Design a protein around this ligand. Structure first.
Ligand SMILES: CC(=O)N[C@H]1/C(=N/OC(=O)Nc2ccccc2)O[C@H](CO)[C@@H](O)[C@@H]1O
Ligand SMILES: *CCC(=O)Nc1nc(OCC)c2ccccc2n1
Ligand SMILES: [Ca+2]
Length: 677
């Protein structure tokens, strides 16, 4: 179950016991970070000249002289061997020896090891994570846990650049970090050194940069300050800006100046990376030369980032050849998944897939932009680690499961059950979607076809939907009480509650389908109406972010099935008993075309596309109104007019006037009312 899978592996079907007495060779000349891991696995057991020999070292150390032809000639490569007589842990360099110990740890199970020989190295030079999303940046504790996660999975790159960090971007990118933040970054560097991770500190100055010597010197003095805190890798981001910062000639000259007077003057600087203004094909200029200007001017040692054909996209062979021909070097991939800062009411916990597995030679690096929930991003981050190290053997679904069993061994099935139905994005401006609920979709669709048109449904499909809802409630309850990874549970709790209510509503709707007598039907109908109101309450109190507030879950297949079945059986009931039950699926306290009202924060809106009127559930102080292509009231009858101001964009302030009724009548497609709460 080795992850990432080695490049060469030979297994024997013999097993040996971890030596109760051993003899260590090279503990004083091999990588201290590797030796530490090794003595943790050996602790309690006896060290002496007598007993089984264990040899650790880098190529060149006396300890591994006998094995120098077995060691691959690759950066961060290594050689591992286990048999009845000895154990050999030999890297090509110090990082190779560490990675050798990471594979060693997985092999050890029940104090036993397999007789095995491994020769291994990475297909992609730089592999890791870039924290470059919009929203609440990762807490200090989350980042400490991230960096240890990367070393176990042989990730060698952590790029720091949260967009909402003011000392990284606007407005204070010229200012050194305050003492509290500086000591915290100094600890992150230490921890990342211990885990063999390059800490890349980025800076995002392009929105108000001036191409003079004052800003150029200040950017360097900040880089020097970051250097004093330990940083040895650096990046400059020019994404999502307007104005003079988009000049490719000035951008290249700045990065070349950083190379020659900073990166070439220090003794120990590693990566130097920049992100271009045009960072995807769809947004580049055909009548232009931005990318060819960078490609010709940028020093060859400086990397250039790229998200692919679009802002959210999969990386193909056509797409990477399109950019490599222009920038005149292999691209440094910035892959925007599972980042969710444009769909903040969803969790994206599905598998990693869609990236070509034969283009390892065509890319300098590969980093994933994750979500603001750090522990939840581990599922996809684990998969990127596997993909980037050995793409030729990358198995999508098997790594998704292996990730889940590593993140939460105590309740892995319960978490897989949760993630299976929390992976799609819903409709979004990028048109980027993922698979969800694929195992139950066939039976779901067959049940609803037959149900809508009087035919009998297969009893097996009906039982498959009952089995689903029942297991959903098991996982929700078990996950909420799980203390193995308390940070993970805290992140997902609002979705876990909504998950459970979805499942309860599902069971009640299926009982409406069975529908024995009239009295039972109305009982289940009233219970569904209560569950709807409960889902509304969570949606309005939990995760009230300023962008897409609320909580959505199981949206691709499960929620449409429950809503469509509820609407259908309610209409059959009204036809049979001549009744007038409400068939609407989402609770809404306000009232009144078929466009439903929405409540987002303190806003009340109509969904975008004598006359008509909106009635609130009470009186509220009014703030403003916005319409895009006349009167208000508090009791219905006594109205009053306020006029609008145009600039498509009609606005008007209410200035705290009491309001309950709003009307538009016949005078000269968003439509929003903002109130005070
Ligand atoms: C290079 C890159 O991806 N930049 C940002 C990025 N921005 O892409 C945009 O949506 N760009 C944009 C679109 C409209 C207005 C302003 C910027 O995409 C990622 C996914 O949202 C964000 O996390 C990144 O910070
Ligand atoms: C919820 C507020 C919001 O949408 N913030 C946000 N801003 C930007 O761009 C700011 C220039 C953004 C870009 C890409 C993805 C998400 C984003 N969110
Ligand atoms: Ca050495």
């Amino acid at each position: 179950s080795l992850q990432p899978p080695p490049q060469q592996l030979i297994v024997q079907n013999k097993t040996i016991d971890l030596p109760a007495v051993y003899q260590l060779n090279g503990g004083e000349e091999a990588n201290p970070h590797a030796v530490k891991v090794l003595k943790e696995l050996l602790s309690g057991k006896q060290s002496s000249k007598k007993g089984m020999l264990i040899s650790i070292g880098e190529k060149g150390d006396k300890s591994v002289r006998k094995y120098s032809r077995q060691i691959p000639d690759h950066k961060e490569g290594y050689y591992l061997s286990v048999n009845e007589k000895e154990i050999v842990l030999a890297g090509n360099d110090e990082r190779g020896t560490y990675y050798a110990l990471q594979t060693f740890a997985q092999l050890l199970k029940d104090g036993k090891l397999p007789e095995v020989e491994i020769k291994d190295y990475p297909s992609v030079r730089y592999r890791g994570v870039v924290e470059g999303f919009y929203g609440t940046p990762w807490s200090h504790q989350a980042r400490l846990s991230q960096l240890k996660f990367y070393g176990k999975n042989k990730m060698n790159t952590y790029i720091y650049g949260p967009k909402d960090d003011p000392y990284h971007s606007a407005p204070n990118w010229r200012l050194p970090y305050p003492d509290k933040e500086a000591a915290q970054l100094q600890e992150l560097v230490a921890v990342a050194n211990e885990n063999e991770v390059d800490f890349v500190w980025a800076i995002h100055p392009g929105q108000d940069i001036k191409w003079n010597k004052e800003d150029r010197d200040l950017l360097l003095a900040k880089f020097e300050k970051m250097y004093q805190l330990g940083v040895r890798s650096f990046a400059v981001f020019f994404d999502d800006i307007s104005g003079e910062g988009t000049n490719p000639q000035k951008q290249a000259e700045l990065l070349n100046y950083i190379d020659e007077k900073f990166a070439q003057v220090k003794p120990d600087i590693n990566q130097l990376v920049m992100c271009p203004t045009e960072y995807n094909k769809s947004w580049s200029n055909p009548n232009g030369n931005y990318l060819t200007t960078l490609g010709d001017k940028l020093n060859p040692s400086i990397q250039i980032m790229w998200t692919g054909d679009r802002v959210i996209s999969d990386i193909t062979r056509d797409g990477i050849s399109w950019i490599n021909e222009r920038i005149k070097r292999p691209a440094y991939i910035w892959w925007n998944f599972p980042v969710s800062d444009y769909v903040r009411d969803h969790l994206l916990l599905g598998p990693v897939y869609g990236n070509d597995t034969t283009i390892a030679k065509e890319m300098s690096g590969f980093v994933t932009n994750p979500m603001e929930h750090a522990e939840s991003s581990k599922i996809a981050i684990y998969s990127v680690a596997s993909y980037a190290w050995n793409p030729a053997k990358y198995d999508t679904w098997q790594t998704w499961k292996d990730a889940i069993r590593t993140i939460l061994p105590s309740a892995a099935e319960e978490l897989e059950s949760f993630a299976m139905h929390n992976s799609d994005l819903g409709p979004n401006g990028h048109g980027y979607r993922r698979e969800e609920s694929m195992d139950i979709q066939p039976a779901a669709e067959r049940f609803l076809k037959a149900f809508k048109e009087g035919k009998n449904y297969d009893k097996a499909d009906f039982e498959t939907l009952q089995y689903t809802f029942e297991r959903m409630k098991e996982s929700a309850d078990i996950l909420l009480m799980n203390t193995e990874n308390k940070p993970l549970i805290v992140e997902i709790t609002p979705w876990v509650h909504q998950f459970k209510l979805t499942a309860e509503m599902g069971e009640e709707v299926l009982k409406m389908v069975e529908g024995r007598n009239e009295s039972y039907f109305l009982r289940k109908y009233n219970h569904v109406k209560a569950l709807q109101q409960q889902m509304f309450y969570i949606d309005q109190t939990s995760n009230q972010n300023p962008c897409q507030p609320g909580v959505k879950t199981a949206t691709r297949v499960i929620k449409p099935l429950i809503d469509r079945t509820f609407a259908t059986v309610v209409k059959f009931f009204n036809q049979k008993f001549n009744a007038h039950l409400d068939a609407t699926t989402d609770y809404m306290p306000h009232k009144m075309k078929n466009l439903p009202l929405q409540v987002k924060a303190n806003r009340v809106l109509i969904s975008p596309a004598g006359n008509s009127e909106i009635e609130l559930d009470a009186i509220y102080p009014g703030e403003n109104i916005q319409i895009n292509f006349l009167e208000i009231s508090t009791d219905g009858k006594e109205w009053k007019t306020v006029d609008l101001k145009q600039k498509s964009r009609l606005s008007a302030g209410l200035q705290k006037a009491p309001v309950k009724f709003v009307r538009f009548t016949v005078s000269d497609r968003q439509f929003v009312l903002t109130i005070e709460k």
